[PDB]
Amino acid sequence: SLSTMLVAEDLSAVGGISLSSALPVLTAMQYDVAALPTSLLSTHTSGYGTPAVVDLSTWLPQVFAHWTRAQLHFDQALIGYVGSVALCQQITTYLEQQTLSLLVVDPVLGDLGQLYQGFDQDYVAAMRQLIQQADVILPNTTEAALLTGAPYQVTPDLEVILPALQAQLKTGAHAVITDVQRADQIGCAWLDEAGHVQYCGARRLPGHYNGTGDTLAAVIAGLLGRGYPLAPTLARANQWLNMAVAETIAQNRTDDRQGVALGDLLQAILALNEHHHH
After folding, report:
1. Which range of residues forms the domain containing residue 220?
2. Residue of 150, 128, 137 lying closest to 191 (CA atoms)
3. Which residues are within 8 A (CB) of 25 and not within 5 positions of it... i.e. 6 or more apart?
4. Are 12 and 44 in contact (CB under 8 A)?
5. Which CATH number covers residue 200?
6. By C-alpha distance, which of 130, 132, 202 is closest to 172?
7. Which of 15, 26, 239, 244 has minimal CB crowding within 10 Å?
8. Number of domains in the chain
9. How far apart are alpha carbons 131 and 135 in whole angstroms?
């Protein structure tokens, strides 16, 4: 492995999203992955009926205490879905104990203008604390508004929302909104060093597919951790996600619940080497 990356997010045994997709992707990108479930589920929460879920709120503190006593050090961290205020707080202080070269947080809170079922303003406040030392955050348009306090807009003014978001981050950090649509494209918008709104996207494909946000975040964290600058990282990540969705469509799947296909993505990674969240 070239470095060690902590990935803390949910693990659903069935469903091909979140940790189940981050593990293969980041392993292929030459990371020693510390794969830390924030929640453990029989299946993901979209289409299988009510899953059987282990509450890990009392476990994560023990994990962090153990890693501390064992003198473990991490180079990078990616934080996805957490799920409770207490766990957000635990993660926040653990990360602060480290000397990470990279922290990426996907501030999972909601979509389509609404908080996910079970999340409230208290959880939003906990998320604002957790993102405070992140190098990169990856909100969607709903999450961007929740984090700044602005009422939801389908198409917010990026010249207003991006500066507001980024000032809630440490100096030099980047707020990246991940679902910005421009004509027939969907992609990422962020501020360059000069404070100008930049965008890159890929042609939007029909349908909706589980695991796209988790896979995007894993790819972005993986590329940044390997030294790629932000702009080319975002360009490549969008292209690779576009490719993964295309492969998913090409598989002519009978079960639409499984997360995005990873095969073409893994191949691209090796070539380079040479309502709830879903």
Report:
1. 1-278
2. 137
3. 215, 218, 219, 222, 262, 265, 266, 269
4. yes
5. 3.40.1190.20
6. 132
7. 239
8. 1
9. 9
